[PDB]
Amino acid sequence: IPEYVDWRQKGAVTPVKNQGSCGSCWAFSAVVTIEGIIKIRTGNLNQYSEQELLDCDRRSYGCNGGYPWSALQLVAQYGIHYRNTYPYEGVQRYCRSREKGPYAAKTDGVRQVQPYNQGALLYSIANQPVSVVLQAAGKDFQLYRGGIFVGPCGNKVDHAVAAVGYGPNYILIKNSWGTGWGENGYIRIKRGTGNSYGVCGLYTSSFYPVKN
Numbered sequence: 771i772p773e774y775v776d777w778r779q780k781g782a783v784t785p786v787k788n789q790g791s792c793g794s795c796w797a798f799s800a801v802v803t804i805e806g807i808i809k810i811r812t813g814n815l816n817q818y819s820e821q822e823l824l825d826c827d828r829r830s831y832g833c834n835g836g837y838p839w840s841a842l843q844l845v846a847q848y849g850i851h852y853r854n855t856y857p858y859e860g861v862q863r864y865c866r867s868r869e870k871g872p873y874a875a876k877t878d879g880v881r882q883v884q885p886y887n888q889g890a891l892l893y894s895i896a897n898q899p900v901s902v903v904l905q906a907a908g909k910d911f912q913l914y915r916g917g918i919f920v921g922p923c924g925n926k927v928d929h930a931v932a933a934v935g936y937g938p939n940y941i942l943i944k945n946s947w948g949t950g951w952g953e954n955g956y957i958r959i960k961r962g963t964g965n966s967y968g969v970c971g972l973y974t975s976s977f978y979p980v981k982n
């Protein structure tokens with residue numbers, strides 16, 4: 771695998787979304803990977819529906835956090851709709867899936883990256899973006915604003931986000947707090963500190979969609 775990886779220059783990642791009061795992170799996380807895997811496969815980049823997972827995942831908790839591996843499972847059974855087709859309201863409203871017609875895309879599977887292992891997490895990122903979790907409950911993360919983030923932060927992972935790249939001493943992360951946070955909505959969390967947990971918890975749970 772290469773030294774550097776930045777999915778954005780491969781035309782495989784879309785503009786930074788904001789999630790608002792909703793604990794929709796999981797959806798926003800799972801969607802970045804789907805958008806990426808498909809462009810990687812097909813050749814076209816299209817925004818997908820976070821609101822769709824948020825409303826149709828029976829195993830998550832709507833605006834009260836959820837499990838990106840279940841939402842990612844959701845898009846494996848049925849599929850996902852374009853973003854304009856089923857736009858983001860930011861409140862959980864009933865499952866308007868079928869009532870919208872035929873899904874925009876569907877994936878072959880979901881998967882787990884061996885946890886607490888910064889190496890597996892790099893093999894994977896070098897194929898397509900991946901769902902990753904961390905800790906943002908802290909003032910430092912909330913107040914981040916550029917440069918390589920090192921902390922301080924615990925390992926009490928809450929927030930869900932996506933990894934769209936890496937370099938020698940950082941893992942490029944796409945977060946959903948707008949473009950007026952971090953590096954235009956992005957954050958470069960440092961890697962290679964030996965910590966088996968990863969900075970802020972970055973290696974506690976990682977999943978990605980399979981697409982033949």
Ligand SMILES: COC[C@@H](O)[C@H](CC(C)C)NC(=O)[C@H](CC(C)C)NC(=O)OCc1ccccc1
Nearest residue numbers: 790791906907912913928929947948950951952
């Ligand atoms: C008041 O914060 C308490 C928290 O725990 C929760 C986090 C939860 C998602 C785990 N809230 C936040 O992090 C807030 C609010 C929004 C943007 C999510 N984020 C935030 O303030 O960062 C965005 C920001 C951007 C530019 C200037 C100042 C702040």
